[PDB]
């Protein structure tokens, strides 16, 4: 049947673009009394899990699509929902889109495997201390949330303060001129719709999304002061359908600017 | 059959379906009240339609919730003016028009924390006693 | 009668019946009290049962009624509960009044005493003060706006809520000291409403509120009470927005105050706004959330009773409908707990329940028909239905909706701790609660794990009672040194993030898995920095828990040393006990959860005085129904189950159990059907609750534990309703095994001492084996390596090991007894140990692998040991044996040579004895001494049950029951036997079943243990039953629900392997206690040595032949190697071959030969061809597999017998058949076509008359077939293409043989029933008449597996016992006395005739079963029924050959005349006829 050979073209061709293997992080007493180890390695762990299973899945499709394998429930239901051009409900382990196809969760999965292989040779080149000062993409990550936590954990360990007292600001920079302070780490991918940010300031714009070139989340004491008039509290959405609600950023509108006006026009930040 | 696309066309609908005998009661503004109301539920069903963008997810802000906000209102100012054939808008129950619109209707089916502020800013924007003014702008820089 | 008060209208059918007959007994309708009122559990009446009183609550708060209602008065018993429940009523409201002018009086006070307070809330009950408080606040509030009226003037406002500040100062310092633990929910209670009062005042006077009538005042849930209203119930009305709700007055006893927060404040503002416009609300939300807390907090503010039903899966709807008609006519609420789990038909059927119900109550805005009868709709009834992400569709415009999308943990926490008395609690909460997000994300994700609300909940709880024990203790401290006592001053300088600690530590760090532990610390050191805590020793535990181990042989340690993890262990079980009701100890199976409980339980029992009494229960053997209680569908009776009988016993107090400390523990595993109802008793209410309504309080002492040792399947809600401990594997390190093995062995005598001093030497002499790294423990090691047919698990091994080991004892003593004159020397002893303890390791690590791993296993211990071994260049000591004489002795020498008698060759009961046999004797013997159950693990046939049966047969006392399990067993079938061949017998220690024989040891043999199907929770009963009496050494009856002691019983088993088709693998905890032996199919040698023997004795007939047996059956074994090789199942599922095709082949040979007096060696070369021919090759699917066959069996005949002629010995038309001559010797094709052609002939004059066209297939096809039916028992399973003839054949040899053919006329309607009924007849008709049936069966006919489970005991035993029974079955014995009277037998007793009706069954009936060539079917129907693949033999019709097609046309178009001499043969001829004459005709070219 030619549905067959055209599956065993698109199996062969995905096969081509995933990346081959992941490494896992090293483990160490100190590497293990570092929070941010600890949640890049549960991370660099799920990715390859579920990079060796969507592997092991496709190269036992090819094998089928030679004849050299037979199709047994599991791999007959992964071949109707790759038919159909439905997700496999095995491969998506993490929070996706539910509109996406396979070949766009491919292609992501792809590129966040890049991004972990880049993150674990990092790692392994240096330590903790270096795994610090990766800029990361939120939407990358499988668990973001997980990320903004492991930064907070980080910063109160580094000053032994208390977790509950620290709060987050967002400091909105371009990647080559930004400074990387003991308690700031960089973000990149993330989106803002609805809003231009120009020197960390909220202005209202027409077009559909401004990307901002590099985020440093900054872990700082609790101020115990009431934020301004002109600060502005805007979601953080891991995709376009706003179903997840990653956390929440402060910014600072431009004068003249209406917050009630930022909040119809549906101003967010999306990490993709 | 589909209703019509249209502020116009769904504000026509709600003075159609609700009868002609009720908006026009003792009080003279009740009918004023109704009118916000209608232009509210309005806008925010025409919100729907740009489900990410508008909302978070494509609510049921059906006929029963604006059935529940006219008895609502009803209540509220019979409550308030208890037979006065004109009431100043500021004796008006504004505050419990807003809190019951924001927290129990429309606002039941709120889960997103964000949706509920975007509804409490059209509330706040909507009803309130500068409403009864000739300048007052239910939108602003449209074209 | 039910419409007059329609209160007591909640009750069902049961409950109404009960209260009519009993209306004079008082005294038993208190349960009908606990099911409909929600506090109040029980009404206190005088000595004469006369007058009631008041009423009492199941905590034992009580209320005196003013005036007393008199029974007597009132015999009617709906007149006088409407009394008791007016007067509950009025009784309260006038409570309310007196608390309200108390507490007015404490109102308006710059200070309240102490003392005063106390009493007051001492006086009046936890529902009635809160409500007291309630009502002063209100009024105050009021007062002060309706003086802020004014506007711009002066606030005294600020002046109530200081009041209220200074009385929750109060309030902070009485529940700092010890308190009665009713006083101190009163305490808490009031102290979260103090809390939320001061919020929300703090919030009105932040809003600079001045008007009485303002939104922001009428939004806050307002109580008003007038004095003045002459109805009592009408006194207090609790307004909230424009909501009015009349206070319902009914009696809540004490319940769980609920916090506050500002979601539950929307929610109170949503539910109110939904019930004033007459429509329900439906909060909708993830799990885990309060949603149901929420309605109820709601419902009891209200003074009203919500029944808050389950919507599980398995949901029931008469009982909900009773439920629900009752709460209809009562008006009390009813709450649906996650609406959407329900089945889609289900959910529409109460959907439009509940939509009629609404339409009433908005059409009250009268009864309405709820089934099939009138309710009274009270217009206070309300419905409120929680979902979990919608609505259903005629619902939607019926429901308000609201979002509890998260709860308010944050002030959840700072509220619980102001109730525990906690200062600084903002500063904890803010810890707290981001601590237990991280734990809920940053640990790694467990089935046990639990970090929700609830168990916040609980910390906080044991938080505040561990502060209040630790202030206990400075007082005590202070008491003994010094005398300055000040509760404040402990209190200031006692640290308190470190009690938050320690409170986290003790209820978390039990269920943290080994590798969790330091990061919880590191998550502290995130949250608490630079606070540490550290345990408590119990060092009076400690000693006692040493004694205890040190008393039951267990090995005992501190910290690092052996045994320190488990200790540490069973001290934090210790904690969690103390904190816990419910506990759950989690774990692998060796993990020593068991023994962890039960030296627990005895060292308690020791240390503090209290006597410790355990109930080990097993929920999954025993029927859900049995094990909660059955409430009669018609008579109502209730029976209560094993757990209601257990717990009813407790709370008797028959005995002073309450005194003791009862443990229950639910030993076995855990899935979401039984414990749903446990959920009600695993919370903080403590209480069960039965479908008749009675709910049973749990007692203090009561602890309700699961020994499970997986998660993977309970559901979270109860996850979070109890404790975990979890019990990983590397806590019962295996020098502990060692060391409970060996001192069990130095201190316990193996017969129950001379033979206690041969243990001692035997210990002393293997200690240096058992050491740490010793050789056992590498070998252990090795062994884990490798591959084994069933699950490796580590207490497997090391129990069969230990076993065997015992029986090396009990030969030491044997020859001991033997030889008085010369006991065994010393050094005799130990060369006899060592080398039985490395034979023992050899069988017993891998006695259940292949010979190529148990190769590699002798290997290794050979490299690793140091014990003299054979010196054998090649042979593994596995063919070894160790003599007595300690001795490395050939296991062939203990092989004989037996000759089997000629009339005896391939007879069901012979035996020959080679290798394999004589090891897995002494293997099943060694076993057998101990009575320890084994698997018997093999492929298909293999000598597994012959093997298993001559073992048991040489053993004399033990006698033989053989049970063949089915995929649809029960422990019904196990109940079945105990009751035919045992007896329960009363004796001093208790009820024992033991077998009506005496003096003989009953073995279960199971000759398909793992067949039976598992449930949709992993989990087989008749499994976890056997593994129930192996391990506890009894069961559980459930006619009286009694612990039943088996005596004399013990369990064998065996099994195909696991990963065979239709094998599901037996549970590990099973697999523990019973050794595996995997009986592979005997070697070339093992055939070769077997079937010599069988056809020497079978030749003796024919001497002049006789020279010939050796090389025979070598040819006869040599074939069938690459057949085995060939065939494999693989290509085929019924392509497998065993050793039992051999046994048949030489069956076959024999039965050809007896008959005949002289045959030449030509002849028997003929029959071995025919026999190899009706074996391997009929069940063959493609032609050249056929092919192949062919000329394989010609190549061997020619290898083995090079100086014979092949054109006669080997011709072609191999056709035997005794139709023409009288014996069985080979006909020719054309005469016996002559024959079964004059047979079809006279069957069309009698039969149905269908022309038959006689291909060269019909006539192998019709011999065959009559083959099977001359043979006792003849089954067969026809193969081939609808339409090719197997009915055709089949009718046609049963009518040439006698045989009657019997097809069941099957329809849609065609039940269970019917087929039982059809198969009753058939069996009446083949035993009780000697009348030879053939039974036609066809896989359209089968509508249900259960027709082929009754098939499969049919062909398995040559009847069905299931079938015939009662006055069926005295129907049966007349008629089968009759039988036997007519042939010549007399016979009494039931079981003789019986037996001869099987006999005669077995003899006479015949059943065929035609099918489709299906292979996917082929397999399932394989797997589904072993029984049609095990003996019945298969034939391959497949479909009509091109020769047999060429025939059928030339026959039937006969008649027309296509004789065309015109005629002209083409150049190319399209020939798809093999044997197309070479020139064609012109009706031969239409043919082909
Ligand atoms: N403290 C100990 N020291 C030495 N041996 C022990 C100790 N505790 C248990 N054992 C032994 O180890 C084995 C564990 O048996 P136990 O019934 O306690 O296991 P378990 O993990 O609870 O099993 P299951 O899940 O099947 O009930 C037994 O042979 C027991 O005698
Ligand atoms: N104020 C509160 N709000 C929400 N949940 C609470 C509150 N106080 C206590 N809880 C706890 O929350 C837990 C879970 O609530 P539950 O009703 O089971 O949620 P769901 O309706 O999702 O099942 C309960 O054990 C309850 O004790
Ligand atoms: N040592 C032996 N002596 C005699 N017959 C044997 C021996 N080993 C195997 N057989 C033959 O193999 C067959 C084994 O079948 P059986 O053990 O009943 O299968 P299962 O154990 O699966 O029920 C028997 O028919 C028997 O004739
Ligand atoms: N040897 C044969 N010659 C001619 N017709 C046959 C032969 N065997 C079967 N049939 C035909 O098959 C029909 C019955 O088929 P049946 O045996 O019921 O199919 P199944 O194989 O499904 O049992 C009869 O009508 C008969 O004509």
């Given at each position: ?33 570092d929070?941010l ?14 990079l ?35 997700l ?79 709060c ?18 960089g973000?990149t991918?993330?989106?803002?719709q ?38 502005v509290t ?39 | ?142 074209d | ?14 409950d ?16 009908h ?61 006038k ?12 109102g308006?006070?710059?200070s ?53 500040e ?8 009485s ?21 939320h ?17 303002s ?29 009015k ?32 416009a007459?429509?329900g ?6 799990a ?21 039903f ?26 649906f ?19 009629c ?19 009274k709709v ?11 992400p ?13 979002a509890?999308?998260k709860?308010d ?35 790694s ?56 600690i ?55 340690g ?83 189950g ?122 002393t ?6 050491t ?18 069933m ?6 091994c ?5 076993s ?47 010979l ?50 000629t ?15 004589v ?20 492929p ?15 053993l ?36 024992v ?9 009953l ?20 499994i ?49 206690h ?24 079978m ?6 032949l ?12 040599e ?13 085929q ?24 007096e ?25 032609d050249?597999?056929?092919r ?26 191999i ?48 011999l ?30 049963a ?33 009780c ?13 089968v ?10 005991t ?55 079963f ?11 129907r ?66 082909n």
């Open positions: 049947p030619a549905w067959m050979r055209t599956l065993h073209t698109t199996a062969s061709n995905w096969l081509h673009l995933i990346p081959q293997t992941l490494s896992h992080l090293k483990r160490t007493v100190e590497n293990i009394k929070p180890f600890r949640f890049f390695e549960r991370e660099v762990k799920m990715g390859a899990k579920l060796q299973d969507v592997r092991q899945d496709l190269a036992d499709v090819v094998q089928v699509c030679e004849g050299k394998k037979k199709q047994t429930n599991y791999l007959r239901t992964l071949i109707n929902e790759l038919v159909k051009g439905i496999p409900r095995s491969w998506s382990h993490y929070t996706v889109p539910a509109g996406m196809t396979v070949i766009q969760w491919v292609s992501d999965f792809s590129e966040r495997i890049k991004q972990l292989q880049n993150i674990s040779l990092a790692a392994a080149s240096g330590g903790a201390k270096e795994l610090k000062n990766i800029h990361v993409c939120l939407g990358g990550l499988f668990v973001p949330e997980a990320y903004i936590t492991a930064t907070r954990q980080y910063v109160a360990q580094a000053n032994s303060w208390s977790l509950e007292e620290l987050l600001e967002v400091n909105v920079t371009t990647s080559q001129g930004a400074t990387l302070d003991a308690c700031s780490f973000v991918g993330l989106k803002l609805g809003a231009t940010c120009n020197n960390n300031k909220l202005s209202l714009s027409n077009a559909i999304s401004t990307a901002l070139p590099l985020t440093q989340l900054r872990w700082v004491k609790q101020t115990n002061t009431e934020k301004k008039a002109s600060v805007l979601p953080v959405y891991l995709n376009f359908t706003r179903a997840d609600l990653i956390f929440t950023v402060d910014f600072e509108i431009a004068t003249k600017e209406d917050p009630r006006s930022f909040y119809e026009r549906g101003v967010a930040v999306l990490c993709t | 059959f589909e209703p019509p696309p249209g502020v116009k066309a769904n504000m026509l609908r709600t003075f159609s379906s609700i009868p002609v005998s009720r908006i026009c009661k003792s009080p003279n503004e009740r009918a004023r009240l109704y009118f916000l109301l209608a232009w509210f539920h309005a806008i925010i069903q025409e919100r729907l339609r740009y489900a990410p963008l508008g909302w978070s997810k494509k609510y049921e802000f059906g006929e029963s919730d604006l059935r529940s906000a006219c008895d609502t209102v009803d209540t509220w100012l019979d409550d308030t003016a208890k037979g006065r054939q004109n009431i100043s808008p500021d004796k008006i129950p504004w505050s419990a028009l807003k809190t019951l619109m924001a927290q129990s209707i429309y606002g039941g089916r709120v889960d997103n924390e964000f949706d509920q502020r975007l509804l409490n800013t059209f509330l706040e924007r909507l009803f309130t006693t500068r409403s009864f003014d000739s300048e007052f702008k239910l939108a602003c820089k449209v | 009668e039910r419409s007059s008060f329609p209160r007591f209208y909640f009750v069902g059918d049961e109404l019946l009960e209260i009519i007959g009993n209306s004079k007994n008082v005294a038993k309708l208190q349960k009290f606990k099911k409909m009122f929600a506090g109040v559990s029980s009404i206190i009446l005088n000595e004469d049962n006369s007058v009631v009183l008041g009423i009492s609550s199941r905590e034992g708060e009580e209320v005196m009624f003013k005036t007393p209602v008199s029974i007597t008065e009132h015999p009617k018993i709906n007149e006088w509960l409407t009394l008791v429940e007016k007067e509950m009523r009025v009784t309260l409201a409570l309310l009044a007196e608390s309200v002018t108390e507490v007015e009086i404490f308006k006070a710059t309240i005493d102490p003392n005063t307070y106390i009493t007051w809330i001492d006086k009046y009950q936890a529902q009635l003060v809160v409500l007291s408080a309630q009502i002063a606040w209100s009024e105050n509030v009021e007062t002060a706006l309706s003086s802020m009226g004014g506007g711009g003037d002066a606030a005294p406002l600020h002046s109530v809520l200081s009041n209220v200074v009385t929750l100062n109060v309030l902070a310092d529940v700092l000291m010890e308190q009665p633990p009713l006083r101190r929910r009163k305490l808490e209670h009031l102290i979260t409403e103090l809390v009062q001061r919020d929300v005042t703090r919030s009105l006077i932040k809003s600079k509120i001045d008007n009485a009538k939104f922001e005042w009428l939004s806050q849930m307002r109580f008003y009470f007038d004095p003045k209203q002459t109805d009592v119930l009408q006194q207090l009305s609790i307004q909230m927005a424009n909501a709700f009349n206070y319902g007055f009914e009696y809540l006893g004490v319940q769980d105050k609920l916090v506050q927060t500002p979601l539950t404040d929307r929610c109170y503002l949503t539910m109110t706004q939904a019930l004033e007459r429509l609300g439906s909060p909708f939300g993830p885990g959330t309060g949603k149901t807390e929420s309605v109820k907090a709601l419902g009891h503010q209200l003074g009203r009773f919500v029944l808050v389950n919507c599980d899966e398995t949901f029931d709807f008469q009982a909900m409908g009773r439920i629900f008609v009752g709460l209809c006519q009562v008006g009390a609420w009813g709450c707990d996650e609406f959407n789990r329900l089945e889609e038909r289900m959910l529409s059927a109460v959907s439009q329940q509940v939509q119900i609404q339409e009433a109550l908005r059409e009250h805005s009268i009864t309405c028909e709820l089934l099939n009868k009138q309710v009270s217009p206070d009834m309300a419905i409120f239905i929680t979902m979990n919608n609505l259903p569709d005629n619902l939607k415009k019926l429901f308000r909706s609201l509890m999308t709860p943990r944050q002030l959840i926490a700072q509220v619980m701790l102001y109730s525990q008395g906690f200062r600084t609690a903002e500063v904890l909460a803010n810890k707290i609660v981001p601590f237990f997000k991280l734990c809920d994300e940053q640990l994700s467990q089935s046990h794990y639990d970090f929700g609300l609830r168990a916040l909940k609980s910390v906080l709880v044991s938080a505040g009672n561990v502060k209040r024990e630790r202030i206990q203790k400075i007082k005590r401290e202070k008491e003994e040194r010094g005398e300055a006592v000040d509760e404040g001053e402990i209190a200031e300088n006692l640290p308190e993030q470190e009690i938050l320690q409170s986290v530590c003790e209820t978390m760090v039990p269920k943290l898995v080994a590798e969790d532990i330091p990061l919880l610390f590191s998550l502290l050191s995130d949250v608490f920095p630079g606070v540490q805590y550290h345990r408590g020793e119990m060092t009076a535990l400690r000693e006692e828990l040493k004694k205890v181990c040190q008393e039951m042989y267990l090995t005992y501190d910290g690092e040393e052996v045994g320190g993890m488990w200790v540490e262990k069973v001290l934090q079980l210790y904690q969690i006990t103390q904190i816990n009701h419910g506990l759950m100890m989690v774990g692998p199976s060796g993990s020593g959860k068991s023994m962890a409980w039960r030296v627990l339980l005895k060292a308690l029992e020791r240390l503090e005085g209290v006597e410790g009494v355990a109930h080990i229960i097993d929920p999954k053997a025993i029927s859900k129904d049995h094990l909660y209680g059955t409430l009669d569908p018609n008579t109502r009776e209730w029976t209560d094993l757990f209601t009988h257990v717990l009813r016993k407790i709370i008797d107090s028959v005995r002073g159990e309450l005194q003791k400390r009862q443990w229950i523990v639910f030993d076995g595993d855990v899935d979401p059907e039984w414990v749903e109802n446990l959920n009600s008793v695993l919370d903080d209410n403590k209480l069960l609750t039965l479908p008749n309504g009675e709910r049973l309080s749990l007692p203090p002492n009561v602890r309700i534990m699961f020994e499970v040792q997986d998660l993977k399947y309970a559901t979270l809600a109860t996850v979070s309703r109890c404790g975990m401990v979890w019990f990983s594997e590397d806590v019962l390190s295996t020098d502990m095994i060692f060391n409970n093995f060996l001192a069990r062995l130095r201190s316990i005598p193996l017969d129950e001492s001379p033979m206690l001093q041969i243990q001692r030497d035997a210990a002499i293997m200690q240096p084996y058992f740490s790294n010793g050789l056992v423990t590498k070998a252990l090691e090795h062994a884990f390596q490798l591959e084994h047919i699950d490796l698990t580590r207490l497997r090391l129990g069969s090991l230990f065997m080991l015992h029986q090396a004892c009990r030969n030491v003593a044997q020859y001991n007894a033997n030889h008085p004159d010369f006991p065994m020397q010393i050094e005799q002893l130990e060369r006899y140990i060592q080398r039985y303890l490395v034979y023992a390791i050899l069988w017993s690590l891998s006695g259940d692998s292949r190529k791993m148990r190769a590699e296993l002798g290997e290794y211990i050979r490299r690793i040991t140091t014990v003299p071994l054979p010196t054998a260049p090649n042979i593994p000591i596995i063919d070894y044996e160790v003599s007595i004489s300690g001795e490395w002795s050939p296991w062939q020498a203990k092989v004989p040579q037996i000759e089997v008698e009339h005896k060759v391939a007879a069901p009961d012979v035996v020959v004895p080679t290798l394999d046999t090891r897995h004797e002494a293997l099943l013997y060694t076993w057998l001494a101990e009575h320890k159950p084994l698997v018997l693990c093999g298909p046939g293999s000598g597994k049950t012959m093997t298993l049966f001559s073992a048991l047969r040489a004399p006392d033990m006698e033989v029951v053989g049970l063949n399990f089915s995929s649809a067993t029960t422990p019904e079938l196990l109940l079945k036997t105990f009751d035919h061949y045992c007896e329960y017998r009363r004796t001093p220690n208790g009820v079943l033991a077998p009506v024989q005496l003096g003989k040891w073995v279960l043999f199971c000759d398909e243990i793992n067949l039976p199907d598992m449930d949709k929770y992993g989990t087989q009963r008749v976890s039953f056997i593994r129930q009496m192996v391990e506890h050494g009894g069961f559980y009856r459930t006619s009286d629900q009694t612990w039943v002691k088996l005596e004399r019983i013990q369990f064998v088993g065996a099994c195909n392997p696991p990963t065979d088709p239709g094998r599901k693998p037996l549970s590990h905890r099973f697999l523990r019973v050794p595996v032996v995997y009986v592979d199919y005997p070697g070339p040698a093992s055939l070769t040595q077997i079937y010599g023997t069988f056809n020497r004795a030749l003796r007939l024919i001497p002049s006789r020279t010939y047996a050796e090389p025979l059956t070598a040819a006869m074994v074939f069938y190697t690459m057949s085995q090789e060939r065939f494999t199942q693989d290509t599922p019924h392509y497998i071959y065993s050793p039992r095709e051999m046994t048949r082949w030489v069956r076959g040979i024999f039965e050809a030969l007896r008959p005949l002289t045959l030449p060696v030509e002849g028997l070369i003929r029959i071995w061809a025919h026999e190899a021919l009706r074996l391997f090759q009929d069940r063959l699917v493609e050249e597999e056929r192949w066959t062919d000329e394989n069996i010609d190549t061997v005949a020619l290898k083995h017998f090079p100086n014979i002629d092949r054109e006669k010995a080997m011709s072609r038309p056709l035997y058949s005794n139709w023409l001559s009288k014996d069985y010797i080979p006909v020719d094709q054309e005469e016996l076509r002559d024959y079964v052609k004059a047979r079809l002939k006279v069957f069309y004059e009698e039969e149905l008359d269908v022309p038959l066209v006689l291909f060269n297939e019909v006539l192998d096809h019709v065959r077939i009559d083959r099977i039916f001359r043979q006792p028992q003849g089954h067969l399973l026809l193969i081939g293409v609808s339409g090719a003839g197997k009915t055709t054949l089949s009718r046609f040899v009518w040439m043989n006698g045989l009657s053919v019997y097809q069941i006329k099957v329809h849609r309607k065609y039940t269970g029933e019917d087929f039982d009924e059809d198969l009753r007849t058939v069996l009446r008709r083949s035993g008449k000697n009348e030879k049936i053939a039974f036609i069966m066809d896989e359209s006919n509508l249900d597996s259960g027709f082929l489970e009754r098939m499969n049919l062909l398995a035993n040559g009847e069905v016992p299931g079938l015939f029974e009662g006055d069926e079955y005295a129907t049966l014995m007349t008629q089968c006395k009759e039988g036997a009277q007519k042939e010549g037998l007399m016979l009494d007793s039931h079981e003789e005739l019986y037996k001869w009706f099987t006999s005669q069954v077995i003899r006479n009936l015949h059943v065929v035609t099918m489709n060539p299906s292979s996917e079917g082929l397999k399932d394989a797997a589904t029924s072993p029984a049609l693949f095990n003996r019945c033999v298969l034939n391959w019709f497949g479909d009509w050959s091109t020769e047999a097609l060429y025939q059928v046309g030339k026959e039937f178009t006969s008649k027309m005349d296509l004789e065309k001499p015109n005629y002209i043969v083409p150049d190319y001829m399209p020939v798809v006829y093999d044997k197309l004459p070479q020139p064609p005709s012109h009706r031969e070219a239409i043919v």
